[PDB]
From Swiss-Prot, chain A:
Disease: Cortical dysplasia, complex, with other brain malformations 15: An autosomal recessive disorder characterized by global developmental delay, variably impaired intellectual development, speech delay, facial dysmorphism, microcephaly, and varying degrees of cortical malformations including pachygyria, thin corpus callosum and subcortical band heterotopia. Most patients have generalized seizures.
Assembly information from the UniProt record: Component of the gamma-tubulin ring complex (gTuRC) consisting of TUBGCP2, TUBGCP3, TUBGCP4, TUBGCP5 and TUBGCP6 and gamma-tubulin TUBG1 or TUBG2. TUBGCP2, TUBGCP3, TUBGCP4, TUBGCP5 and TUBGCP6 assemble in a 5:5:2:1:1 stoichiometry; each is associated with a gamma-tubulin, thereby arranging 14 gamma-tubulins in a helical manner. Gamma-tubulin at the first position is blocked by TUBGCP3 at the last position, allowing 13 protafilaments to grow into a microtubule.
Identification of the protein by name: Gamma-tubulin complex component 2
Protein family membership: Belongs to the TUBGCP family.
Full-sequence portion shown in this chain: 259 to 516 of 902
Tissue and organ expression note: Ubiquitously expressed.
From Swiss-Prot, chain B:
Function according to Swiss-Prot or TrEMBL: Component of the gamma-tubulin ring complex (gTuRC) which mediates microtubule nucleation. The gTuRC regulates the minus-end nucleation of alpha-beta tubulin heterodimers that grow into microtubule protafilaments, a critical step in centrosome duplication and spindle formation.
Gene from which this protein is expressed: TUBGCP6
Name this protein carries in UniProt: Gamma-tubulin complex component 6
Lineage: Eukaryota, Metazoa, Chordata, Craniata, Vertebrata
Family, as annotated: Belongs to the TUBGCP family.
Location in the cell: Cytoplasm, Cytoskeleton, Microtubule organizing center, Centrosome
Disease implicated: Microcephaly and chorioretinopathy, autosomal recessive, 1: A syndrome characterized by microcephaly, cognitive impairment, underdeveloped retina and choroid, and epilepsy in some patients. The more anterior parts of the retina, near the periphery and pars plana, have a grayish hue and diminutive vasculature similar to retinopathy of prematurity. Visual impairment becomes evident during the first year of life.
Domain of life: Eukaryota
Binding partners and assembly: Component of the gamma-tubulin ring complex (gTuRC) consisting of TUBGCP2, TUBGCP3, TUBGCP4, TUBGCP5 and TUBGCP6 and gamma-tubulin TUBG1 or TUBG2. TUBGCP2, TUBGCP3, TUBGCP4, TUBGCP5 and TUBGCP6 assemble in a 5:5:2:1:1 stoichiometry; each is associated with a gamma-tubulin, thereby arranging 14 gamma-tubulins in a helical manner. Gamma-tubulin at the first position is blocked by TUBGCP3 at the last position, allowing 13 protafilaments to grow into a microtubule.
UniProtKB/Swiss-Prot annotation, chain D:
Protein name according to UniProt: Gamma-tubulin complex component 4
Function recorded in the entry: Component of the gamma-tubulin ring complex (gTuRC) which mediates microtubule nucleation. The gTuRC regulates the minus-end nucleation of alpha-beta tubulin heterodimers that grow into microtubule protafilaments, a critical step in centrosome duplication and spindle formation.
Disease involvement: Microcephaly and chorioretinopathy, autosomal recessive, 3: A disorder characterized by congenital microcephaly and chorioretinal dysplasia associated with poor vision and nystagmus. Variable ocular anomalies include microphthalmia, retinal folding, retinal detachment, optic nerve hypoplasia, absence of retinal vessels, round areas of chorioretinal atrophy, and attenuated electroretinogram. Most patients have mild developmental delay and mild learning difficulties.
Entry's family note: Belongs to the TUBGCP family.
Tissue: Ubiquitously expressed.
Coiled coil regions, renumbered to chain: none
Complex and partners: Component of the gamma-tubulin ring complex (gTuRC) consisting of TUBGCP2, TUBGCP3, TUBGCP4, TUBGCP5 and TUBGCP6 and gamma-tubulin TUBG1 or TUBG2. TUBGCP2, TUBGCP3, TUBGCP4, TUBGCP5 and TUBGCP6 assemble in a 5:5:2:1:1 stoichiometry; each is associated with a gamma-tubulin, thereby arranging 14 gamma-tubulins in a helical manner. Gamma-tubulin at the first position is blocked by TUBGCP3 at the last position, allowing 13 protafilaments to grow into a microtubule.
């Protein structure tokens, strides 16, 4: 019975080590949030052990009772330890450890005891990435201090300057990354790059391409509101594109004088 | 553990009573192993629905363990077994419901290792057992297991009914989607399509009734088609406003559970009116 | 048959209470079932012998519901209520 | 057609709960329900799917209630039926 109770301790120490090692700056912004929302469950585990110790103080707890008492938390710790092991094993960072969290939520679809945990981890870990996507979608800036966001900006001005030989803005300045796509936004991946690349060629010229409203975006499972959000921003930005190319750096006179 | 022939204050009858309690014990251990074995995140052999089944079973096992705990520590020898008779037979029945529990009964070896159905086969097998054993005392357990087990298929239905998104891992869902769709042409749909109205010949009369077996396919290909064409005023992907996701132990017979799955017809009708061939695409003009 | 189980249970409790109890005491406390069990035996026996089919079991128990033993009558009445359960249930679909 | 299905399910449930079989209340529930359905059934056929018209068509064609049409049919298809 001791041996049958012990797997939660093996699924406690390995759980803590994950949270200590992948809190460093190097592993990226989303791997920080995953362990940062995983440590709260360790606090709640400690809270459980406090109550069990008090009952043990009053001589009113037995090993056979402790068995049933610890069953609800054993499952949570098993899910967290397996997810931690997989995130470590794949060397997943950025969106590669935002796709795995979305897929594991599908994996348990009927359970509802481990499922709710998995959605809570994905909601917690998707907060920074959706902030970067909000910035990218509603303004041309890509803050992205670490290489995690799917869209990337090469400093291709070095070669293309004075004359834009390559048409870099439309060709190879603002480009996409493949392995850092969240696997739930893959349907919108190209549209996103288009959405913000369109913004940049007016945000670069001084004229301000502001949105009507910068709708905050957050992950949700079974609900695709972000999908329509991405279309909404794409539509309006693509509309202001003619509100630049015909207003400042006016194309009509330039074509006439060609 | 048993005492045979010489024993310490244990005439044979005591051992026999311990032997029935032992039968209950072996059934608990086997069933606990069967349900305990989790998905492991790579359960290719079984399905998502089997994983849901095991979860619900574990819920019951936890309750049974709780009653075992709630037994007083100080209780008389005969009284323990008489107290636990009903739960013992209930659990042995539950064991025989699954192959694993049925196997290793004590009257036969572990060699048979009867194959447990998975997928639509499992769901349908559970429902026919529900009809067979509706009236007996054991029926609440079956109802609870079925309620939990059906949920994955309801969500599959939702995803390819209100949306056109095609999603599966092991292809236990009857309606099968392939990559030949991705070529986006007129041929390759003799290859794509769907498994027959019955999975092979194994129809799920419980879920499909043979009624929505075709209709789910029709609405799915319709929504996926018009949506593929372009966002239109009525749907425009998920722009449709707030569609409710929906999808005596039973005072009515068990077959009435079709009433819960009835609302699908609403989206079917809205789809057929919204039409895609006729008014949207101007097929008559072509 | 459940009250027989409970009766034997209460006996064991009282024997825990007292370590020297005559067999006559057991005879007393169990003598009410001494009459009920033989009565139910023929009810099962006719079903086995005559291979009674379907609803005819309902009649078979009903005709022994006229037994002149009130306890036997009530006991069999419970069983008929249970089986009328299934009959009413099958009627609850077709009707 | 009306969904008193649940209500009569409740009635039959109480009938389950009663300890001893009462032929009178069993007869009552089946009849009263057999009045909400077995009787209300009559009104449904005669009104929802009017039988008067159906019987009228049956006499009009099986029983030569349409004299002009049947006489004309004989006249037009005389030779074909004769052969």
């Amino acid at each position: 019975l001791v041996h049958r109770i012990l797997p939660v301790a093996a699924s406690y120490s390995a759980v803590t080590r994950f949270i200590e090692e992948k809190s460093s700056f190097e592993y990226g912004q989303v791997n920080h949030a995953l362990a940062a929302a995983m440590r709260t469950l360790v606090k709640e585990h400690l809270i459980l052990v406090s109550q069990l110790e008090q009952l043990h103080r009053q001589g009113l707890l037995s090993l056979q009772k402790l068995w049933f008492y610890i069953q609800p938390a054993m499952r949570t710790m098993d899910i967290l330890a397996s997810l931690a092991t997989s995130v470590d094993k794949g060397e997943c960072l950025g969106g590669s450890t935002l796709s795995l969290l979305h897929d594991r939520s599908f994996s348990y679809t009927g359970d509802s005891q481990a499922q709710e945990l998995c959605l809570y981890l994905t909601k917690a870990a998707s907060a920074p990435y959706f902030e970067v996507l909000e910035k990218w979608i509603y303004r041309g800036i890509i803050h992205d201090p670490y290489s995690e966001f799917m869209v990337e900006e090469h400093e291709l001005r070095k070669e293309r300057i004075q004359e834009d030989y390559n048409d870099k803005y439309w060709d190879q300045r603002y480009t996409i990354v493949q392995q850092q796509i969240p696997s739930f936004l893959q349907k919108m991946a190209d549209k996103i790059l288009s959405t913000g690349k369109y913004l940049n060629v007016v945000r670069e010229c001084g004229h301000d391409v502001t949105c009507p409203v910068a709708k905050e975006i957050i992950y949700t499972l079974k609900e695709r509101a972000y999908v329509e959000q991405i279309e909404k921003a794409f539509n309006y930005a693509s509309k202001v594109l003619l509100d630049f190319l015909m207003e400042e750096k006016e194309l009509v006179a330039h074509l006439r004088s060609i | 553990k048993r005492g045979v022939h010489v024993s310490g204050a244990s005439p044979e009858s005591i051992s026999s009573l311990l032997s029935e309690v032992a039968e209950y014990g072996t059934c608990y251990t086997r069933l606990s192993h069967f349900s305990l074995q989790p998905v492991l995140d790579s359960l290719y052999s079984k399905g998502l629905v089997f994983q849901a089944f095991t979860s619900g079973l574990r819920r019951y096992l936890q309750y049974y363990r709780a009653c075992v705990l709630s037994t007083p520590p100080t209780l008389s020898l005969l009284t323990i077994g008489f107290l636990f008779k009903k739960l013992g037979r209930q659990l042995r029945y539950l064991a025989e419901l699954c192959g694993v529990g049925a196997v290793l009964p004590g009257t036969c070896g572990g060699g048979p290792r009867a194959a447990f159905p998975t997928g639509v086969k499992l769901l349908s097998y559970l429902y026919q057992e529900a009809l067979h054993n509706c009236s007996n005392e054991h029926y609440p357990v079956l109802l609870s297991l079925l309620k939990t087990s059906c949920e994955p298929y309801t969500r599959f239905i939702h995803d390819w009914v209100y949306s056109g998104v095609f999603r599966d891992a092991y292809g236990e869902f009857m309606i099968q989607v392939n990559h030949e769709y991705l070529s986006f042409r007129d041929k390759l749909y003799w290859t794509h399509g769907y498994v027959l109205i019955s999975k092979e010949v194994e129809d799920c009369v419980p879920v499909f009734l043979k009624h929505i077996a075709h209709d789910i396919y029709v609405c799915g290909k319709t929504i996926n088609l018009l949506k593929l064409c372009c966002p239109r005023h009525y749907l425009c992907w998920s722009d449709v406003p707030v569609p409710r996701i929906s999808v005596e132990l039973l005072t009515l017979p068990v077959l009435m559970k079709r009433s819960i799955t009835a609302p699908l017809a609403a989206h079917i009708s809205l789809v057929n009116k919204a039409d895609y061939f006729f008014v949207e695409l101007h097929l008559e003009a072509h | 048959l459940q009250p027989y189980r409970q009766a034997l249970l209460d006996l064991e409790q009282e024997f825990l209470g007292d370590p020297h109890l005559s067999i006559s005491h057991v005879n007393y406390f169990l003598d009410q079932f001494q009459l009920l069990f033989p009565s139910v035996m023929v009810v099962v026996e006719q079903i086995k012998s005559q291979k009674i089919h379907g609803c005819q079991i309902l009649e078979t128990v009903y005709k022994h519901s006229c037994g002149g033993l009130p306890p036997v009558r009530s006991a069999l009445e419970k069983i008929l209520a249970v089986c009328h359960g299934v009959m009413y249930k099958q009627l609850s679909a077709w009707m | 057609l009306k969904n008193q299905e649940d209500t009569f399910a409740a009635e039959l449930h109480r009938l389950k709960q009663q300890p001893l079989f009462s032929l009178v209340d069993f007869e009552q529930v089946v009849d009263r329900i057999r009045s909400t359905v077995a009787e209300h059934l009559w009104k449904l056929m005669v009104e929802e799917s009017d039988l008067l018209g159906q019987l009228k068509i049956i006499k009009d064609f099986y029983l030569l209630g349409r004299g002009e049409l049947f006489q004309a049919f004989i006249d037009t298809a005389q030779h074909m039926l004769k052969t």
